Amino acid sequence: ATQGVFTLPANTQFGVTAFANSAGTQTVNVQVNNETVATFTGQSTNNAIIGSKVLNSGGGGKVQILVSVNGRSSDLVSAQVILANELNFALVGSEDSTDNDYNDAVVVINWPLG
Amino acid sequence: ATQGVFTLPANTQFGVTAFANSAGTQTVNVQVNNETVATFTGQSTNNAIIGSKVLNSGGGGKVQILVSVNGRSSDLVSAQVILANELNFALVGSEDSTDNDYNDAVVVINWPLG
Amino acid sequence: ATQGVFTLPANTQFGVTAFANSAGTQTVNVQVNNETVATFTGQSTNNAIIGSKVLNSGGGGKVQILVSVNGRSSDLVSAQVILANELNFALVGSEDSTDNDYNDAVVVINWPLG
Amino acid sequence: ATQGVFTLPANTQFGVTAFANSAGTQTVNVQVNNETVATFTGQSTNNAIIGSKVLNSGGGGKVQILVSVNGRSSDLVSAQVILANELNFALVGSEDSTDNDYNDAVVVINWPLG
Numbered sequence: 001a002t003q004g005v006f007t008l009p010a011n012t013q014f015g016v017t018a019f020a021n022s023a024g025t026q027t028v029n030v031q032v033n034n035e036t037v038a039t040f041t042g043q044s045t046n047n048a049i050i051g052s053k054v055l056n057s058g059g060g061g062k063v064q065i066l067v068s069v070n071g072r073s074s075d076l077v078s079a080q081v082i083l084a085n086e087l088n089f090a091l092v093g094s095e096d097s098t099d100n101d102y103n104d105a106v107v108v109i110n111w112p113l114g
Numbered sequence: 115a116t117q118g119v120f121t122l123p124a125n126t127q128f129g130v131t132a133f134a135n136s137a138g139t140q141t142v143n144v145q146v147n148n149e150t151v152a153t154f155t156g157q158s159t160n161n162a163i164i165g166s167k168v169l170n171s172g173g174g175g176k177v178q179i180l181v182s183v184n185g186r187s188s189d190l191v192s193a194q195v196i197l198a199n200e201l202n203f204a205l206v207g208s209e210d211s212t213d214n215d216y217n218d219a220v221v222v223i224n225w226p227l228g
Numbered sequence: 229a230t231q232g233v234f235t236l237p238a239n240t241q242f243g244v245t246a247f248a249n250s251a252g253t254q255t256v257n258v259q260v261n262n263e264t265v266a267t268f269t270g271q272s273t274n275n276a277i278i279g280s281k282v283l284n285s286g287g288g289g290k291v292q293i294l295v296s297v298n299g300r301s302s303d304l305v306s307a308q309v310i311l312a313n314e315l316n317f318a319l320v321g322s323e324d325s326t327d328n329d330y331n332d333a334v335v336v337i338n339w340p341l342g
Numbered sequence: 343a344t345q346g347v348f349t350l351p352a353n354t355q356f357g358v359t360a361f362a363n364s365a366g367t368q369t370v371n372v373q374v375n376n377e378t379v380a381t382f383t384g385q386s387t388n389n390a391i392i393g394s395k396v397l398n399s400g401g402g403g404k405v406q407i408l409v410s411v412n413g414r415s416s417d418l419v420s421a422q423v424i425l426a427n428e429l430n431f432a433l434v435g436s437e438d439s440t441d442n443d444y445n446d447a448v449v450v451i452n453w454p455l456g
């Protein structure tokens with residue numbers, strides 16, 4: 001299945017935060033309604049934050065995360081969870097190699113804000 | 115039900131990150147095996163990160179999150195999700211008032227690291 | 229927080245299935261837009277299905293699950309999870325006593341159907 | 343990523359339940375520690391239960407779900423969710439065609455029992 005794609009409510013503020021856990025430098029692309037609106041680049045093997053931004057979901061509410069390392073696409077896994085019928089998390093893991101830890105870049109999207 | 119308590123594997127490094135979305139200053143207490151090991155404090159209505167740390171789950175693996183505002187306990191909600199049978203997220207929302215957005219302090223725990 | 233309350237897409241078919249794991253006979257009440265539309269009763273300590281029905285979420289999309297054992301309300305836990313940005317589960321556990329296994333009645337709501 | 347593989351606690355009773363939502367007859371294969379221990383076969387476009395069984399996770403705790411329709415493997419999506427640090431759901435959707443509803447066979451695994 002396609003992974004890393006989430007339908008948010010339209011025209012809604014959300015947070016996006018990326019963490020790195022790999023020898024490789026991670027490149028995280030954030031697309032809103034099929035346009036790149038943020039790119040995070042960084043390297044850590046200890047969960048450093050390589051980007052954190054507030055964005056708007058735009059007319060369609062479509063948010064897509066893509067992860068690569070020097071142009072090679074990582075394999076993605078994702079899901080959305082809703083707590084108390086109101087608090088939303090859209091969660092992404094990614095794998096750049098063969099160990100299947102899926103933490104090489106970790107992306108957390110949260111809404112609502114405020 | 116008790117919320118904000120998670121059993122991690124023993125002796126495991128994990129990340130903990132807190133976000134704020136409230137008029138009130140949030141205090142996030144992190145306990146590992148019933149001992150406070152981190153306290154994050156901050157105020158934001160726009161998802162500022164008020165703390166991010168790497169911790170070890172120790173012998174027992176017990177991690178607990180408590181959220182308060184000037185000593186008054188917020189109401190908590192939580193769940194754990196596992197992707198690809200390997201990537202773990204432990205998630206907490208909290209509510210300090212009556213609007214039930216549950217985002218007043220948001221806490222994300224992730225493992226494995228590295 | 230209130231637990232067992234989910235906003236589904238309006239006017240949408242969904243499944244509801246309940247399982248029992250307790251000495252006590254479980255009563256599961258399903259409300260759609262504040263009206264009881266299904267009641268499941270049964271006893272099992274081995275996960276027997278005590279009911280499964282297809283319902284419509286109606287104009288408001290509100291679905292609420294209540295669980296009781298001989299007239300006493302059980303304590304509820306819940307969350308919603310979305311896979312592949314399409315497949316939805318609303319999940320409820322319940323506890324009728326002191327052991328906090330939260331499996332005494334387990335309810336799974338799934339959509340879309342068809 | 344590999345999907346439909348879960349590490350359960352070892353030597354633990356669990357429930358597995360399959361639902362069908364497709365024109366095609368679904369065949370669900372359940373493996374515990376790499377041995378087939380159940381096969382569910384059935385057809386429904388309205389969420390009928392095509393199998394429900396209690397199984398044990400054995401020494402290794404490994405559970406794998408595979409879905410096929412008339413010999414063609416369906417595409418899988420999955421995740422695990424834990425409520426109240428105790429109640430576990432391992433969730434699988436599957437897609438047998440082109441519409442990407444991922445509900446063609448839905449598989450729910452739940453533990454603990456009893």
Ligand SMILES: CC(=O)N[C@H]1[C@H](O[C@@H]2[C@@H](O)[C@@H](O)O[C@H](CO)[C@@H]2O)O[C@H](CO)[C@@H](O[C@@H]2O[C@@H](C)[C@@H](O)[C@@H](O)[C@@H]2O)[C@@H]1O[C@@H]1O[C@H](CO)[C@H](O)[C@H](O)[C@H]1O
Pocket residue numbers: 114135136137138159209210211212213215218
């Ligand atoms: C009107 C106001 O300032 N409300 C904020 C609330 O203050 C009340 C105060 O007016 C008086 O009634 O005493 C109350 C306690 O008895 C309380 O102090 O304080 C809330 C707690 O900080 C605050 O809500 C928080 O912050 C908001 C920005 C929002 O993130 C909420 O989720 C959060 O719980 C009240 O702020 C208003 O909240 C409403 C929603 O209920 C709107 O967001 C308003 O824009 C906020 O001003």
Ligand SMILES: CC(=O)N[C@H]1[C@H](O[C@@H]2[C@@H](O)[C@H](O)O[C@H](CO)[C@@H]2O)O[C@H](CO)[C@@H](O[C@@H]2O[C@@H](C)[C@@H](O)[C@@H](O)[C@@H]2O)[C@@H]1O[C@@H]1O[C@H](CO)[C@H](O)[C@H](O)[C@H]1O
Pocket residue numbers: 021022023024045095096097098099101104228
């Ligand atoms: C031996 C080594 O350095 N392996 C890392 C591997 O290196 C590749 C390099 O050997 C080859 O010549 O070039 C390719 C690109 O064309 C690679 O650059 O690179 C992967 C991806 O960066 C590393 O795995 C990542 O970092 C690890 C620290 C870990 O977070 C892992 O999850 C992540 O995918 C390889 O590093 C090794 O990974 C293993 C586990 O497979 C151990 O963690 C080792 O300690 C670590 O060096």
Ligand SMILES: CC(=O)N[C@@H]1[C@@H](O[C@@H]2O[C@H](CO)[C@H](O)[C@H](O)[C@H]2O)[C@H](O[C@@H]2O[C@@H](C)[C@@H](O)[C@@H](O)[C@@H]2O)[C@@H](CO)O[C@H]1O
Pocket residue numbers: 342363364365366387437438439440441442443446
């Ligand atoms: C024309 C035809 O017979 N198509 C078959 C699919 O059924 C149609 O699917 C579409 C959506 O793609 C829509 O529901 C139509 O009403 C169906 O007739 C069939 O798809 C499978 O069965 C569907 C009922 C639906 O559950 C879909 O998600 C599922 O994958 C496929 C595979 O059985 O066969 C097609 O020939």
Ligand SMILES: [Ca+2]
Pocket residue numbers: 022095096097098099100101102103104
């Ligand atoms: Ca890796």
Ligand SMILES: [Ca+2]
Pocket residue numbers: 021022101102103104227228
């Ligand atoms: Ca890694």
Ligand SMILES: [Ca+2]
Pocket residue numbers: 136209210211212213214215216217218
């Ligand atoms: Ca609030």
Ligand SMILES: [Ca+2]
Pocket residue numbers: 113114135136215216217218
């Ligand atoms: Ca708030």
Ligand SMILES: [Ca+2]
Pocket residue numbers: 250323324325326327328329330331332
């Ligand atoms: Ca119980």
Ligand SMILES: [Ca+2]
Pocket residue numbers: 249250329330331332455456
């Ligand atoms: Ca029980």
Ligand SMILES: [Ca+2]
Pocket residue numbers: 364437438439440441442443444445446
């Ligand atoms: Ca389909």
Ligand SMILES: [Ca+2]
Pocket residue numbers: 341342363364443444445446
């Ligand atoms: Ca279908």
